[model samples]
Target chain A: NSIQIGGLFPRGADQEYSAFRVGMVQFSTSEFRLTPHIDNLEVANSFAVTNAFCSQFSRGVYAIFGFYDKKSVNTITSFCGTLHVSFITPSFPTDGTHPFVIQMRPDLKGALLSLIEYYQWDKFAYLYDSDRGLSTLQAVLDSAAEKKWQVTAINVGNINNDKKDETYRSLFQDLELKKERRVILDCERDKVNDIVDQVITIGKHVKGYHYIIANLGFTDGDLLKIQFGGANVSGFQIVDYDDSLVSKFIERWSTLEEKEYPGAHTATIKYTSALTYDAVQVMTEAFRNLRKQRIEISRRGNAGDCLANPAVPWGQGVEIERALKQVQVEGLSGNIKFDQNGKRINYTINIMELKTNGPRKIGYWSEVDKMVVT
Target chain B: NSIQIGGLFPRGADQEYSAFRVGMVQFSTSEFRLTPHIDNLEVANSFAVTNAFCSQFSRGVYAIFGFYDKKSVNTITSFCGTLHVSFITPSFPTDGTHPFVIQMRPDLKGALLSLIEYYQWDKFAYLYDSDRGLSTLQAVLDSAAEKKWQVTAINVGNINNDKKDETYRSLFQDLELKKERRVILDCERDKVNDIVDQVITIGKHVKGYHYIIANLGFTDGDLLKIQFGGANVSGFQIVDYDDSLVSKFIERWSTLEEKEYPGAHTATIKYTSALTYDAVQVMTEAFRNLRKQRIEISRRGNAGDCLANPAVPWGQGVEIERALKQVQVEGLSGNIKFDQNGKRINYTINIMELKTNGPRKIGYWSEVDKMVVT
Candidate 1:
């Protein structure tokens, strides 16, 4: 019998869904193929997410997967914990651990900080984009004393796309006047293009400046624009494009049928997409392990009145959750493992730096080893 | 005919409940009294809040009121907007406006910034307490160059109360070493005493230091300890104690029987407590105005199946909300008025400064006139 799973995606999250389906193809086997019941809605609306989740809860899915936005993620986390269903997410990890909730992505905080420390930069400019940016940089700034690092932060958020060119120019102009070379770009990946383009146009400022793209998906955007800048450009990447697993996925994903995939198709995958793909693999492995251990796998949930006070939990939820936590596999996002709290453990993020030739992996950061330079 | 209202307070939110009850007593008249259905739950839990909201929705209440925490506040906001129930909250206002939600407190952003600008301090240290702290200070830091202000922020949060003395000492030591005298305190009101006491103990540093309590409840905490420090201490206060309304309330509150009010017995009210009291007044006045205008006021709803898509809304939800927006009265927290979006408008905050004698009103900050020195 096919195993039923639920996928709750946002209305515009096509890349997440595409990677999910790609992972589904990798994991589904002849004996017990995976059946995904997908629902698309506005994730920011708590009411909408709750409704979608309740509907899925009634459908008796073993796991609910999605790229939940930071705003309404708590909704999914709470329900999954109470209802005894697993929630697999590629979103940023929550600070607190919730039972039966799997956070697939590596914590961005540690990796970003480690890279910053690795460079041995004493001071830099931090350009923040969203409200969430403050949370990420607050600790980084706090550590400035401990490490003797100085940081100047500026908000490059909440501007019109058309006006972005002028704003980016203004930002660089101020930087040039102030003679601030080293800058940390903590903005949306899409906006990186405008910033990089403006840097290219400014010409003289580009040569001396060092830019660090503050995200796991360093190569997700067009870094080629600023490759010839002769500046010290560095970033972190979870998926090593040259790695055998990723190389195969890229080849396969490169020739992906547009009608079937229906996303912004590119050879390169986003950090979230890679994490989503890894999550599907993890889920499949968990099920396989459960079957091997003779833990009677069955759909025994209808969740009659999901709002009912203390609704009956799934019979084997704890067992399945235990199996998920026990999963360890080498996936697209590198060596995947989890702790008791379902937090990612023993993951590797390759540190990439842009050279005149191209972007090359200079080193890797690991939880146990910290940051390592080649 | 009586008006039915709902109050959802967090567990152990006694002050909020006490103030709400105090408001209820003030509003209920001989002709028609307000019947309040109060529910105390963990407001941080999304499920608990949703369950509570649905329960209240099923109760056919014209409006729901409470001190909602920032975490699960969105849940109530979404449901209130969808279910067409007016929600009156004294908690921190959301950045975006939701329909049928009344924010009782004045926006803290503009007032705090105005006070800082009025001080003309070139640089200061910002001590933040939570993740919410970043949102408050990021804008403050961004406006640094515009107003020629420089800020250094420290996270004095997530520390044991017993060990607070040592930590506050460490904080001061760092500041002292760096020659930082001007400081802005953005923390819990309870912790203010500890910080103030620490400042008192560190006598030499206290003389030159200027501390601005980054909250509306500037005088809520015991600033008595630091009064003799001879520092230029300042903060914003919504409740003018010398005002006729506050003088009567303080005298009444001081002699009140302990059995009636189970909260922290105090002559002085906290910022939120005063806001809660004002919210109750606004709600009552809205109903009174509605009656005067001869609007058909009726709760023709059971909200049968709150989980049902497009559940029937409260019959006069829009009308009641309109009345709430139209309300204008002098409140404990200054003038009670609301914009069409339910944000507080046309409010006054008396600027309080700690002189050698005690905390005294030095000036006032208003929405219209801004920071006015007397």
Candidate 2:
């Protein structure tokens, strides 16, 4: 039995495009061929995201995998709940459990708290971007309340904005005045890079200062450039390069022509792309299992005009979501599993600390413990 | 077919208790009885709300109707989504369209915008209570952007806080210094009274001063005490006391002993109570329609142990939710309807203005037009 699924990528997102192509080539078997319909969304345009998702829903897709920025996540989640379609994402974790949304990324709340406890930080400054940063910051605040830790939190500008030079400078001045040596920075990957660059320019990247970047994409290669700075840098990595599956995927990825796969000629793959590849595998497994249960997926409308069609809720959707939650598969991103709430759980994140030589794996953090030294 | 439903209320919440009793009596019939299992929650304790809901879910409730404070709303919404149970609420609207939550209140965004336009005030100061006030304030801000109205917004502390004397004075001093005579107050009823008292004490309650209270319960008696302050105070009301359905409900409500129904002695019911009464009718109509479609709701667990049990999703849940969406009933509050997302729509709100004698209906607003003078 064949099934169709959908994927959403930000318009002109080179990494996502490459990952989608690679996932399709690797997983689509002949007997159970998985056909993917991909749509590109304008950045932060929630209406466009809803339109794209509804378009896929009309075509009777078995499930959908996608990416969403902070502004568009709500729109996509509400649409998925309304339509009863399973949406898998490698995006930032939602504030809470939302049905029909399978978050492939491990929530950073626990990890951030673990790192804080591991360092035995009694006091620190937390610089966040926007309201989106609140979820990550909330866990720390709760921990601070219980532990009586001195936590100074502040909002920088929108992490997505490219023009925040003045804001960043002001933030740095405040941090310096407060004499905060240990800092937690929560923002977009680009913002993290920008903030780190500013810190180097300000000459704070010395023996006395330390920064913990609270974004999963810290190890995704852009921030590697910051390692040359003398200050200690720390973060978590979900994609274990030591894993053979990731190495084989990278081998295949490296052979692809640069012209065909934009941003994927290098050996390293972004965490989002790796998660996307795994999301595809999870959906494919779910579809196969549903077939094993003799659940035939019936398509309703023509391909191009899905919004006009009244897509009926397949009883198989519940079973398919259940299957997705039960899926245990190793993809480019280490072992992937989900709790009943569809949150990625039972996974280990490698903690990396950057020294003068280079970034090195210091230890790993799991759901079970604070940290395990390598 | 008979269905067992549930209600959650804060312990000693007199209005909620009376309303649930009123709703139970109004909706029960010979062919269809909506038997309600009611539970009282500790005020602001989210854990109590979840336990109560799971208790009801374990009893195999056909649906649950209740109230939730901001603290408890997320927990209830997540629980409802997880168990695939229908939850109808008369509390404040949630942030977005949650899957299993059926909001029975009309969104105040439109009504507030309409009121601003009706007044033709180009500039105003918004005095809000807490973060919860932002949603109501946001609609006005959006309208201000579109209409080019000048708005100065500020938080006025929690209305329920005991230490508001200094804050209220400080807020009024700022408003007075700014010479802002037109103000929009978004807070609890008690806060409205407190702020108005401060306004009188500060001598701002004169002919030129205008205050608009943005709350569903603005018409709930206590605010009337502020009419004597000599300010042009105004608000909106959804429960039409003139309706025969309301009169009938009140006729039955007044007969109940005052000792038994703490808040039922008055013929004029609060807006929450009215909405609660309507929520039951809507759920009743939904259940009858589901039964007409030959949908059966079978219980799977013992009556008292829902938390220990994982409730399985019944195939009929989707159909039952659809039935709820398709329900069109004229309730005490007016024409009760739901959009596909389960947001209450196509309802009218009566614009109210307070005079020295009492509160008077100045006009009415609906989805179609801004305002029609009564």
Candidate 3:
């Protein structure tokens, strides 16, 4: 291996250049163009982590903030919320597979609350879907109303069939869209599909020129498509739910001949990779710490070895096993963490946009903010 | 205060141009041009929150998607950290009354670390001042040592003092600066007087074209006094710390007659105004929560009527408590944060330079990054 003190750092075969394996997957723009790019959620979550770590490793610092590889027990159940109304279970289902049906209204409320916090809007309106979206619309509406601003209008509409007439009459109520500065179109995925179409058509009829779309989900590519210039959703901002960011990383990883990769791959790196990479760094640092402490590798076997391993968690890897314990790696993403939950304690969010043909930049999370939800 | 809610939903006063009593003080164009632009920090953080909220409020929507706010926080912090640095801190420790300090190495590690977390740096050398700096540097060096990267050979003598020989020798050996990819010259305020002077003379003797001058601690306004023209520190990218930023804010605050003061007397807006402003917003929000739950305002207030007293903690006058708490108000600069901690937790680091006259913008934090101790 060329990895001497003055040579390349030693890493496992696949991880030679990459400190650890990082996975990424962007959503299909064509698929997202048809509906809100809901599939992108997984991708966004994953890439936000991958791009974060790999980029940091390129600089030779390997530090993983603590994060476990285990998936949440409710992962499947949690995903059910993304489905259309028809797929939602009517009764309270407690099977682990499809745990609980999130009331659509509250989901809209969660999304809307984020928008409100970011935009700091003083007054806003929510357009409710009556056609079996969620019975909880009243609760969210009540909360907003309790906040003192009027709810403007809420309509009961049927998503399965063509109840557009009832929706238009009940929701429209002759209220001018332009006059209302902020609005949330809280509808089911299917309803979201129809409402989006309606919004584009009606936007021209409204007086207000600017707006942001919420209570809707879309793929990264879809958000970008709309952001870059798509018809049905030309004016509003959308959250991305795709892992296409990984595709870009793959593109970068493929270019192995170059000693120094060009462009800003740092922005594209994911936080997941940061965690895994740090795991490797921590493992390797454990060995370094041992060397510093003059603890011989033969001092003990697995148990003693585990004890000697740096402050990193051990999983799969040969290169990381050489160090002492309690080592910390300063990764490209944020910091690597070790916690009791066996999961990364670092909270890094990737907020991106689909621009032109690929992902263009938006921004990233900082260390000052520990990814704590308020 | 002339806060136009367009079509007033609620009116506490009938006048259009009633003064909103507030005080502001700005220290724009301070002596130090590249290290500490406290004025800009105050404005930038405030501005980010304010701009987002105002723009949202203008939409007439009080509720926004939570995703947008989270994304905004990420973008804003990164935007600020990559572009700014300060050269001054307290030359002699003051009683902390003056929110001012003249830092010799304006690119202090803690500040930069916070920024790194904020801006998300990758592969760049993150510097420091004390043991923290040393440890961070050691980590970076150890990683670089394993990665076969060349050690940086910085010409510390470029910015010289009587102890140049000792400082340079100690740093070179301790940090392996000579073997790293880039060399950095870091010193204290007292050292910069002689250090930067010798930098020009010593720089010619050095071979590497790439180097970093952490820079002079105080004002180079009198660069005319030295024959070097900050040449030893020229050409290299500068982490600008401006004193004039305060002046700029004050200049705007002093003209508040045009702004319709909240009160008859208004003090100049200081860089710290943003913090104070956010603090007020936070206090009022807590007050509103207590009111909503029918709880006494004992925690944040002295009496029950304190909730009705319109004034938020930072001196903001809210005519409608419920609507005000829910509505995002633009602070002196821009940012709006009422979630628990009202302070604008984000930052804006601007990349600039000091010409013969003053600082000039060269780039932004969103695009560029710095090479610190690593």
Candidate 4:
């Protein structure tokens, strides 16, 4: 089952419905137990939020939380506004050339770090524009080295105002590729256009050619789609954007759940939503155990041993967070494991291929081709 | 400073206030481009969307897309309805057990297989719990080994039926613990009472003891909120019930971020609302980049390249999500990260101290304590 993307659904319906479980938690309306629905963990009995971001942060479970405006049937308004907060457009990555071409952003430093760590990219480089009349070559070189990206030659160049010797010509001569150069184009799009053309021209003339572009946060699939009369690229991204991940929503109906609710039973046996899902499941089981043992979940009191005492049948212990560490479950996908960073350590990157006609789509990688999260 | 967390304020009270901008990147209706916002790159104006999943998948940047309620909001749903299908709920990690839980509706074996192989977990394990009793046990053992956790024994028990004397007592005697015995409760919450009680009764005399419960779905946190008050015990969980994380929303807000949007952002940042913030930031960057490139973001056509192209001048291609993968941004109080499974990784797991400060008050991770995540 694909995780209904965007966490939205109508009142509990079937597979086609959109909604997620929320509000089923047995919290004191006034006391604010600091939890979401703790009772029925199924879509039918829960209230659907727009996205899961809030649920994870709040340590509560929700179906779908709207992050973008869905009311507009035509225009796609970049993102949805959450009931609580406002988000602004983040900065674009920029390279220090031309004062226009942006490189990747610093905010992406973390993600990039994750990617690099995942791929174990011990080395990288920065080819400079000699004619741009810029400085900081040494500083950037040192930083690249610090990031473990081996500092290759700083191929300096001049801005091709127009009809001039290709700006990257010197770069080509210096870093001439005898074999495929897994080069990462850390330049602007416009500048990228120039380098790509020259590289292709040089490659056509050279032998044994191959190359790779860092791309930052950009996509080359569309470019391939247009140039090749269709999407003909091989591996443009490490991550696959699946529409199914966003469309399917948890459906909650009747606002009540029976002990024999099919969704609840299956949820325990299956782990699909990562730590958030498992966390919700653990909370549910804890509550059920407490009820069976004549414990009052509604009564709030300080009890360190209560939580530490797994036999107590409750969560929220003094070291509750630590106890929740690496809590694994058999979800719809596999064992949903929590890492030290409170993030699921499951590898989900897919290697995709494109096809035309009939299926006219891209092929995906299964567990056989999964990427590990370093 | 921490990215300003607030609502989209009106700029001169025009255009319905639209979306706000955080971090950097300049956007205009004509085209969104990356101006020198933040994170000075070695170059400029050279970045763009390199791998836009929007063209291939209907929903652009979001992980979840295509649900009916989300249809109106998800741009991909408006375009290729069938091509970009939605995912089913309770979808576990398909890639065998590594760290995160794996799930997939068995109905679509092919898609599931593809998804697993894409992430490379095909060869993990495949065992029916009815026979194996715990399909996740072996993986847990593997993970435990990696973390240097001693394996005492694997006990499959039924609390009241034939667990204690026939199963658990024997397990306890055979598997002596130096410090403690970590027991992962994989049974239904309904069936855990007798087991938990038996555990307490047996461990009362067994010094240096601990118990861990696993696969707990939707159990109440306050379960046994006050029981076995001072017994030496502890429960390992991935999440705390009673909305421990949610409480942080208010606490985190009170300390900072209140100046910008404050309670509004704090309250909403929890649950699915968090994704709203991320969604908005990503979209704004992508959209603005299109504007800067002088590319028309039309409702249809192969503009995916323009939209997804890394060369666009909007977001640094490294949006908050990117940053999310790296730095622990103080998003209201809980600092978080993202693992490969798209699971939000918390930098620290706060252990709540049971006290009379109110009823169920929350606490943070002890300043001098740490747990490992394998």
TM-score of chain B of each: 0.93, 0.91, 0.34, 0.36
Task: After superposing candidate 4 on the true structure, give the runs of residues whose Cα lies further than 4 Å from its correct spot.
Answer: A1-374, B1-150, B153-208, B213-220, B223-226, B235-245, B248-333, B337-346, B351-374
Candidate 1 lDDT over residue span B117-167, tens digit each: 777778678888763435677778667634445567777766776667778
Please give the lDDT score for candidate 3.
0.30
lDDT of 3 by residue, A250-284 (tens): 45555543334322243333222333344334444
Q: Write the per-residue lDDT of candidate 2 for residues A284-315, one digit (tens) a residue.
A: 78877777778765555543332222434556
Per-residue accuracy of model 3 over B1-374 as CA lDDT, tens digit each:
11111111012221111211132112212321111101111121222322333233333321221111111232222211221110111111111111111111112333333333333323332233331123233333333332322222222323334456556445444443323323344433344444434444444224332233343222322233343244322212222323454344445555666435542224322222233333233333433443466543222222121111221221122213223334344333333422221112222334333455644544433212443221
Candidate 1 chain A, run of 10 with poorest lDDT: A130-139
lDDT value for model 1: 0.78
Q: Best DockQ goes to which candidate?
A: 1
Docking class of 2: incorrect
Candidate with top TM-score is 1
Candidate 3 wrongly placed segments (more than 4 Å): A1-374, B1-127, B131-182, B185-248, B252-295, B299-346, B354-358, B366-374
| Candidate number that wins on TM-score, 1 or 3 | 1
DockQ of 3: 0.01
Residue A220's lDDT in candidate 1: 82
Name every residue pair that clashes in candidate 1: none
- What fraction of the reference interface contacts is present in each model, in order? 0.40, 0.00, 0.00, 0.02
